[PDB]
Write a protein that binds this DNA or RNA. Structure first.
Lengths: 8, 298, 294, 8
DNA sequence: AGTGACATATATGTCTC
DNA sequence: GAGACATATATGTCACT
């Protein structure tokens, strides 16, 4: 996933 | 535990000035010789005898064992708070740090953690250690029975949303996937209730970010703004504005690829950059500024 | 029911009997079948292991009169705790209205600790002035007297302290040594993972800083600001960082005599309030900046 | 108490 | 996947001093 | 109170499908 979807 | 209950029984019995012989009454339900073994710790009482002891003492059986025993230490929730609440944004140094923290959490609390907490840590470890769909195991490999049950559930739990996040990680950059299954769980993710469990809402926000990123890769913007609104509903209900910069990036990519509006796309990007700068996240702002420069803006 | 509550919770988590029993070193799948079917009454040893595996307490598993607090209460409690009124009368009236809704709906099932939190929060929100509002001693004699003797503070302890800070704000004559004791103890508190505790702790830190400004006692002022930052950094509740920038703006203006650095901190609070889209907070910070000769 | 201290 | 058979463990009762 | 022996129940191992 891109960086913005890595909210964990 | 043997002494913990026998001490509580003897203390409450002696403070009420009731003797052992008076408590046991005729002996139909409990004898004096056994009550000595229960209080002194030689024997652990059964439920039927513990119910009689509570009834004679005017307490409920809950009150005799109302001790908060086998409670998860505060250090776990503190270390768990660092794992759930500090987004790595797929940064290698932040991912490895959380992978290190999971190893520390597992060593110290494995014998005491419940199954759902251990499952949360395990799914989180795979999501963090995920690299690419070719080098990382499929969701139907490490969570076979679990993901099959998720395909049929209507009300998703925290661990169910975590499995869906890993499944979203394997879908990205992939062709010839189960299309109908993807659209179905999208509908079910957009149907989940937003309550006050921040761990749930953060993971729910992650799935919403993964859906939009998949819709952008698929160039399918149907219900894209619906995913955006539910993402803002999670932020506004939980007041966790640490994740709002990601939403502004979605609205920018929506204006750039669906509306063909590079003016609004560069404007929502700037809102994300000033939001990340006001949050003082160097990795987040430098990542958003690299995305705007890659999309041909600013 | 004891075997049925275990079986229902085990199937709720989609957990098989084998996973719950693991290697059988503490409980065999054979005996878990007998327990769930009611053929055998589980001893406290095995029931303690079952509770640990299911994430529930033994009390939750066998309490006949066990009442469960619905999610609607914590949703209403989340709105009462997490949405700062900033002493706005409309936001105060809305929370006082919500407090009355919460009470009439859940009073019969809420324990005394939760009703005490709603009680103190009702007096904090509906506070008018140290003269008219009830004195802290009048209503919270025991709680405030224990706070005087207590070293570690709870959530309701910090709430009583906040109501004490509201009464202490306007008075020119006050107990100076008692106020110094409370400051050091609030600064000594440890930041939990409970957001409600950290929010009330942040409120006490904001009231301490506001009291030092009214008293013009800027000793240990940066220590309070640092702890207010530490609370924000650990809970990631950035809805309160604009209030920290106001503290730094007040510190530059009134103590460091640096107006240009005080206006820059004010501008950072206004920008922070604007990106949060809280116009009530943004309008209050801009009004405070202009009233401070800026 | 001032507005910035009314974080409730 | 739940069974039943049978031994063992533990609590409990009934003496005994 | 405490030790001795018997009993009821919970639990574990085996065996079977």
């Amino acid at each position: 996933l891109p960086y913005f979807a890595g909210c964990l | 535990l043997k002494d913990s209950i026998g001490l509580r029984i003897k203390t409450e019995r002696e403070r009420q000035q009731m003797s052992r012989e008076v408590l046991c009454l005729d002996g139909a339900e409990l004898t004096v010789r056994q009550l000595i073994r229960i209080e002194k710790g030689e024997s652990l009482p059964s439920l039927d005898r513990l119910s009689y002891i509570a009834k004679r003492l005017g307490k409920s059986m809950t009150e005799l064992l109302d001790q908060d025993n086998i409670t998860i230490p505060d250090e776990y929730y503190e270390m768990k708070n660092r794992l759930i609440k500090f987004p790595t944004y797929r940064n290698p140094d932040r991912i490895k740090s959380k992978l290190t923290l999971i190893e520390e959490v597992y060593e110290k609390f494995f014998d005491i953690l419940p199954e759902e907490e251990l499952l949360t840590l395990d799914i989180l470890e795979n999501i963090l250690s995920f690299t690419s769909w070719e080098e990382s195991p499929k969701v139907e490999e490490i969570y076979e029975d679990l993901f099959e049950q998720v395909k049929r559930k209507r009300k998703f739990s925290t661990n169910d949303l975590l499995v869906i996040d890993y499944y979203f990680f394997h879908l990205y950059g992939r062709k010839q996937y189960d299309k109908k299954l993807f659209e179905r769980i999208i509908k079910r993710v957009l149907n989940q209730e937003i309550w006050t469990d921040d761990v749930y809402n953060i993971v729910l926000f992650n799935d919403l970010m993964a859906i939009a990123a998949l819709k952008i890769f698929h160039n399918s913007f149907s219900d894209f703004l619906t995913v955006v609104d539910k993402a803002l509903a999670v932020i506004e209900k939980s007041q966790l504005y640490s994740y709002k910069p990601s939403v502004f990036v979605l609205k920018a990519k929506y204006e750039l690829l669906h509306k063909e509006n590079k003016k609004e796309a560069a404007e929502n990007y700037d809102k994300a950059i000033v939001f990340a700068s006001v949050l003082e996240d160097s990795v987040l702002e430098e990542s958003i500024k690299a995305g705007k420069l890659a999309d041909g803006l600013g």
